[PDB]
RNA sequence: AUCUGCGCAUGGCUCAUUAAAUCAGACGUAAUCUGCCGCAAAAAUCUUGCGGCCGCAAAAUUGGAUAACUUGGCGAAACGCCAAGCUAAUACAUGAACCAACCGGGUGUUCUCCACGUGAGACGCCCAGCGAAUGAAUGACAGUAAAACCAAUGCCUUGCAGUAACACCCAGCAGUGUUGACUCAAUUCAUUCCGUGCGAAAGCCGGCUUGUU
């Protein structure tokens, strides 16, 4: 039982400083994974800059002034990971945590009846007792009665508000989809193909807009559209686009040299 | 008795200092339960009994939508079965 | 303490394992339940997690099933009569996993006789089966017509006493449940048994 | 509404194996009937002259008991004159099965 | 009258206690169909994944193996890997050779290495010393077996 | 102050041990345990007060402790100790019928029919909660076409077109868990659980409008 997480340990994304200090905040157990969520506290004080300071992020958790899928948590050790909606009521935040192309976390702004609809990634399939199909998604919710048609790959458009599913996009070929983990991270395409390996990972190949083909681990793709086009959720500027390194350094040296 | 007020026979005890004012203590009466204690505990009741029979609701629910599903197919490849059965049988009639 | 660890162990090699740490809780064991066939008594004994493990020291009754027919009753148990490890287990009327004991065959013979109408014990408290109303004569000759006993269980039955063996854990569950043995298995047994006797 | 103007009345529960088509008849006294069918679901489908007679015999035998049973009794959508038209087609067809049979 | 009961296999009963598979009751007078092979017995006999056949043998054999992964709980996961037979002298066991070259960096050449394993070959299968084996990682069977044969080259 | 709850298995330190060890990349655990934390679920349970087991009623008005404290203290001391008097808990123990469902299994020498029993229908009483144990059964299929006959059973009508299943009260209230794989998830039936499980903490705090919902 480890409680403390050194901040070389910690993860890079969270942008911490080396020489700030020795620790950082250790994500307390919940929705989503240690090393694949954002906590409470780096957001509303590395991110929103509304806390200077650990003692100020306290002072607004506590008071349940940041709420989480319209839940008001008081843990800044809370995992808040990718999907999740944060408001702040009293400043009117409603931003969604997000990826974007270089796979840093992003804070996408939303409106009203977007910040109501969540989109969750079902992992597992289990009867329960009574034979009550359940569904377990990617941030540890457990849906009591899913489409007769869910399975384990496909994401449900979850009413957080209301609490009941509205919708289901199934995993197949020409979906479009953004890579939730490894070298890809943040980029979205349209599944063109998906290698089954019996007892090992598949392997999906997706190309995104632009044309340009990647392949990825089926588990780090995330369905959020029938089409490249129409798309379920808002997504970060870049909309997934990797942009080549070489055009990206001479536009922002054109752009910095215009701003002078 | 019972239905008899407690708070009045509890034993208060004397404190008595220099001026200031004459003290009475008398412990918090605990184990002592008012309609409000009452309202809340039946509450508890009631709330168990909704969440149970709302849960018993979800579940015929899903029943329904599951079995109006299979009735659909059923009964559309019945009809596709009577088609092709009275093109058999249109041939049959007359030779 | 005891372990169940492979740093005691010699390596396929034939060397010796030069052991760098102090043993540890999480791969620790216990002493044996060694349970009798006596009156019931048992000890709980707390494992990891916080669960409970009944230790039984000694049992007498438990729930043995006729497997064939898909029912079971609890029943005294009379004897242990053999057991494959060691012959030792038996002369210590040790009751472990997979053990052949001897049961009380009165509530098998009585439901049996409320099933199907059949008594064995008057071809040769109790039930009576001409008792019975004759909607329940109808129910007996639908299910008498699809079933055959084995004349190994009913002369057993006869007897009072049936062969049965132990499918549960009485050191780690604290119940000896079992099952009768039916088939070649009985016929496998008895065999065994009758060299004893020669 | 298919059921108002309908002469077809379905009557639950009757037991066939309990009762006769006579005993179901004693009930259905009173109004002439063209046919009386009893099903394995413990209920009746009976065809009266009139519509008139039809709707007048659902208020006045319905919540009665019939043979120990509470008994309801309703306005059915089905037709005789269907039911009639239906089965002069299909007994041209089971001539033709037969005749295909020894062919 | 009196049901007739199965006799008892004595080529397979050598052991003290009797020999049975735990998945199926070979006792039950009307079996189900469900685990019945084509000699009318009762066999449970799964369908291990990854693409791999049940062997007639095991789908139709006399043989009770508490250990083999067609014919009971061990379930096979992890590596599949590949081997040559080198000793079989051990009962219901063999010894397989992993021969491979291995890349000395300093002197950009390769060098013959080998890798022993001990391995579980169920009575589906008889494999010969030099024979061409599958193997399939399961959980520890004993102090050096982890790994079942699935299929004999 | 002292009960109660939680933490103290982290952090810090050092590198003595240590070569099928440790460790690294890569994999498993379908061989397992897991407090905190996330999202869920929960219809077992005859209790209480009054009068004479019964009757009648019901916002269940549960019961013993025991610290701190006090009194008398012991000991050279001791992050040492007796003994007696108080007094609470979200400590400990106990315990909630009805409201309040659906659904199944076993039966009665039980009645009502119907036929002269695979009959039907009431009614009685014995069990039917989660988790656990043992035993059976599910946990699909996927390498063939036509008639007969008999028994039963549905219909059609008075011979088989046509026909989800199902002898009412539910005419679709699961014929369909999951995996690469399961003896797994879940379901049903039989019998069992003896503390070594299971309160609505018989809990607390606010609002208001101030409410036997
Ligand atoms: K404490
Ligand atoms: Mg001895
Ligand atoms: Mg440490
Ligand atoms: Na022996």
Same mark, same amino acid.
């Given at each position: 039982?480890?409680?403390?997480?050194?901040?070389?340990?910690?993860?890079?994304?969270?942008?911490?400083?080396?020489?700030?200090?020795?620790?950082?905040?250790?994500?307390?157990?919940?929705?989503?994974?240690?090393?694949?969520?954002?906590?409470?506290?780096?957001?509303?004080?590395?991110?929103?800059?509304?806390?200077?300071?650990?003692?100020?992020?306290?002072?607004?958790?506590?008071?349940?002034?940041?709420?989480?899928?319209?839940?008001?948590?008081?843990?800044?050790?809370?995992?808040?990971?990718?999907?999740?909606?944060?408001?702040?009521?009293?400043?009117?935040?409603?931003?969604?945590?997000?990826?974007?192309?270089?796979?840093?976390?992003?804070?996408?702004?939303?409106?009203?009846?977007?910040?109501?609809?969540?989109?969750?990634? =079902?992992?597992?399939?289990?009867?329960?007792?009574?034979?009550?199909?359940?569904?377990?998604?990617?941030?540890?919710?457990?849906?009591?009665?899913?489409?007769?048609?869910?399975?384990?790959?496909?994401?449900?458009?979850?009413?957080?508000?209301?609490?009941?599913?509205?919708?289901?996009?199934?995993?197949?070929?020409?979906?479009?989809? #953004?890579?939730?983990?490894?070298?890809?991270?943040?980029?979205?395409?349209?599944?063109?193909?998906?290698?089954?390996?019996?007892?090992?990972?598949?392997? /999906?190949?997706?190309?995104?807009?632009?044309?340009?083909?990647?392949?990825?681990?089926?588990? @780090?793709?995330?369905?959020?559209?029938?089409?490249?086009?129409?798309?379920?959720?808002?997504?970060?500027?870049?909309?997934?686009?990797?942009?080549?390194?070489?055009?990206?350094?001479?536009?922002?040296?054109?752009?910095?040299?215009?701003?002078? | 008795?019972?239905?008899?007020?407690?708070?009045?026979?509890?034993?208060?005890?004397?404190?008595?200092?220099?001026?200031?004012?004459?003290?009475?203590?008398?412990?918090?009466?605990?184990?002592?339960?008012?309609?409000? =204690?009452?309202?809340?505990?039946?509450?508890?009741?009631?709330?168990?009994?909704?969440?149970?029979?709302?849960?018993? /609701?979800?579940?015929?629910?899903?029943?329904?939508?599951?079995?109006?599903?299979?009735?659909?197919?059923?009964?559309?490849?019945?009809?596709?079965?009577?088609?092709?059965?009275? &093109?058999?049988?249109?041939?049959?009639? *007359?030779? | 303490?005891?372990?169940?660890?492979?740093?005691?162990?010699?390596?396929?090699?034939?060397?010796?394992?030069?052991? &760098?740490?102090?043993?540890?809780?999480?791969?620790?064991?216990?002493?044996?339940?060694?349970?009798?066939?006596?009156?019931?008594?048992?000890?709980?004994?707390?494992?990891?997690?916080?669960?409970?493990?009944?230790?039984?020291?000694?049992?007498?009754?438990?729930?043995?099933?006729?497997?064939?027919?898909?029912?079971?009753?609890?029943?005294?148990?009379?004897?242990?009569?053999?057991?494959?490890? !060691?012959?030792?287990?038996?002369?210590?009327?040790?009751?472990?996993? @997979?053990?052949?004991?001897?049961?009380?065959?009165?509530?098998?013979?009585?439901?049996? *006789?409320?099933?199907?109408?059949?008594?064995?014990?008057?071809?040769?408290?109790?039930?009576?089966? @001409?008792?019975?109303?004759?909607?329940?004569?109808?129910?007996?000759?639908?299910?008498?017509?699809?079933?055959?006993?084995?004349?190994?269980?009913?002369?057993?039955?006869?007897?009072?006493?049936?062969?049965?063996?132990?499918?549960?854990?009485?050191?780690? !569950?604290?119940?000896?449940?079992?099952?009768?043995?039916?088939?070649?298995?009985?016929?496998?047994?008895?065999?065994?048994?009758?060299?004893?006797?020669? | 509404?298919? &059921?108002?103007?309908?002469?077809?009345?379905?009557?639950?529960? #009757?037991?066939?194996?309990?009762?006769?088509?006579?005993?179901?008849?004693?009930?259905?006294?009173?109004?002439?009937?063209?046919?009386?069918?009893?099903?394995?679901?413990?209920?009746?489908?009976?065809?009266?002259?009139?519509?008139?007679?039809?709707?007048?015999?659902?208020?006045?035998?319905?919540?009665?008991?019939?043979?120990?049973?509470?008994?309801?009794?309703?306005?059915?959508?089905?037709?005789?004159?269907?039911?009639?038209?239906?089965?002069?087609?299909?007994?041209?067809?089971?001539? /033709?099965?037969?005749?295909?049979?020894?062919? | 009258?009196?049901?007739? /009961?199965?006799?008892?296999?004595?080529?397979?009963?050598?052991?003290?206690?009797?020999?049975?598979?735990?998945?199926?009751?070979?006792?039950?007078?009307?079996?189900?169909?469900?685990?019945?092979?084509?000699?009318?017995?009762?066999?449970?006999?799964?369908?291990?994944?990854?693409?791999?056949?049940?062997?007639?043998?095991?789908?139709?054999?006399?043989?009770?193996?508490?250990?083999?992964?067609?014919?009971?709980?061990?379930?096979?996961?992890?590596?599949?890997?590949?081997?040559?037979? &080198?000793?079989?002298?051990?009962?219901?066991?063999? #010894? #397989?050779?992993?021969?491979?070259?291995?890349?000395?960096?300093?002197?950009?050449?390769?060098?013959?290495?080998?890798?022993?394993?001990?391995?579980?070959?169920?009575?589906?299968?008889?494999?010969?010393?030099?024979?061409?084996?599958?193997?399939?990682?399961?959980?520890?069977?004993?102090?050096?077996?982890?790994?079942?044969?699935?299929?004999? =080259?």
């Amino acid at each position: 039982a480890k409680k403390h997480l050194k901040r070389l340990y910690a993860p890079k994304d969270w942008m911490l400083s080396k020489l700030t200090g020795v620790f950082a905040p250790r994500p307390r157990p919940g929705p989503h994974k240690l090393r694949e969520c954002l906590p409470l506290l780096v957001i509303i004080r590395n991110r929103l800059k509304y806390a200077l300071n650990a003692r100020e992020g306290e002072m607004i958790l506590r008071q349940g002034l940041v709420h989480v899928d319209n839940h008001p948590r008081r843990d800044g050790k809370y995992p808040a990971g990718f999907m999740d909606v944060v408001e702040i009521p009293k400043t009117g935040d409603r931003f969604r945590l997000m990826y974007d192309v270089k796979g840093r976390f992003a804070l996408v702004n939303l409106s009203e009846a977007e910040a109501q609809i969540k989109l969750m990634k =079902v992992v597992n399939l289990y009867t329960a007792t009574g034979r009550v199909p359940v569904a377990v998604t990617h941030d540890g919710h457990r849906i009591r009665y899913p489409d007769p048609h869910t399975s384990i790959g496909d994401t449900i458009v979850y009413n957080v508000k209301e609490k009941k599913c509205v919708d289901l996009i199934k995993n197949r070929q020409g979906k479009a989809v #953004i890579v939730t983990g490894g070298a890809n991270r943040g980029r979205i395409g349209e599944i063109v193909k998906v290698e089954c390996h019996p007892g090992a990972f598949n392997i /999906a190949h997706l190309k995104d807009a632009s044309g340009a083909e990647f392949a990825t681990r089926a588990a @780090n793709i995330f369905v959020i559209g029938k089409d490249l086009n129409n798309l379920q959720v808002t997504v970060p500027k870049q909309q997934g686009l990797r942009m080549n390194v070489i055009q990206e350094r001479e536009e922002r040296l054109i752009a910095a040299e215009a701003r002078k | 008795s019972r239905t008899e007020d407690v708070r009045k026979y509890v034993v208060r005890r004397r404190v008595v200092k220099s001026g200031k004012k004459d003290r009475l203590k008398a412990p918090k009466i605990q184990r002592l339960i008012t309609p409000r =204690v009452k309202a809340r505990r039946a509450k508890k009741a009631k709330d168990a009994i909704a969440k149970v029979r709302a849960s018993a /609701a979800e579940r015929r629910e899903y029943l329904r939508l599951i079995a109006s599903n299979r009735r659909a197919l059923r009964q559309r490849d019945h009809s596709k079965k009577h088609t092709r059965k009275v &093109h058999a049988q249109r041939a049959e009639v *007359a030779a | 303490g005891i372990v169940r660890s492979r740093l005691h162990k010699r390596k396929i090699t034939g060397g010796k394992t030069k052991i &760098h740490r102090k043993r540890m809780k999480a791969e620790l064991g216990r002493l044996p339940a060694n349970t009798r066939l006596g009156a019931r008594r048992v000890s709980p004994v707390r494992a990891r997690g916080g669960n409970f493990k009944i230790r039984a020291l000694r049992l007498d009754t438990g729930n043995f099933a006729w497997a064939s027919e898909a029912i079971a009753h609890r029943v005294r148990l009379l004897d242990v009569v053999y057991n494959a490890t !060691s012959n030792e287990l038996v002369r210590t009327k040790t009751l472990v996993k @997979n053990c052949i004991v001897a049961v009380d065959a009165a509530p098998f013979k009585r439901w049996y *006789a409320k099933h199907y109408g059949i008594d064995l014990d008057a071809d040769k408290d109790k039930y009576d089966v @001409n008792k019975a109303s004759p909607k329940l004569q109808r129910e007996w000759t639908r299910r008498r017509r699809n079933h055959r006993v084995e004349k190994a269980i009913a002369d057993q039955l006869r007897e009072g006493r049936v062969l049965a063996r132990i499918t549960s854990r009485p050191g780690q !569950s604290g119940r000896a449940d079992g099952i009768l043995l039916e088939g070649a298995e009985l016929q496998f047994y008895l065999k065994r048994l009758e060299k004893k006797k020669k | 509404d298919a &059921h108002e103007n309908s002469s077809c009345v379905f009557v639950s529960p #009757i037991f066939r194996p309990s009762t006769t088509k006579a005993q179901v008849m004693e009930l259905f006294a009173g109004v002439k009937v063209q046919r009386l069918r009893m099903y394995r679901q413990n209920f009746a489908y009976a065809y009266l002259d009139s519509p008139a007679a039809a709707k007048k015999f659902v208020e006045e035998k319905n919540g009665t008991e019939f043979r120990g049973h509470t008994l309801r009794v309703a306005l059915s959508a089905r037709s005789l004159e269907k039911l009639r038209a239906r089965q002069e087609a299909a007994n041209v067809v089971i001539a /033709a099965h037969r005749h295909y049979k020894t062919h | 009258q009196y049901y007739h /009961a199965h006799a008892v296999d004595a080529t397979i009963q050598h052991e003290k206690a009797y020999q049975r598979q735990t998945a199926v009751n070979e006792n039950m007078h009307r079996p189900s169909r469900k685990h019945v092979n084509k000699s009318g017995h009762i066999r449970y006999s799964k369908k291990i994944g990854l693409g791999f056949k049940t062997p007639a043998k095991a789908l139709n054999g006399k043989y009770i193996d508490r250990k083999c992964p067609f014919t009971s709980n061990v379930v096979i996961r992890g590596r599949i890997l590949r081997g040559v037979v &080198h000793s079989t002298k051990m009962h219901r066991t063999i #010894i #397989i050779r992993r021969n491979y070259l291995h890349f000395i960096k300093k002197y950009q050449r390769y060098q013959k290495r080998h890798k022993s394993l001990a391995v579980h070959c169920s009575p589906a299968f008889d494999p010969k010393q030099g024979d061409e084996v599958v193997i399939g990682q399961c959980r520890p069977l004993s102090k050096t077996i982890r790994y079942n044969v699935l299929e004999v =080259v």
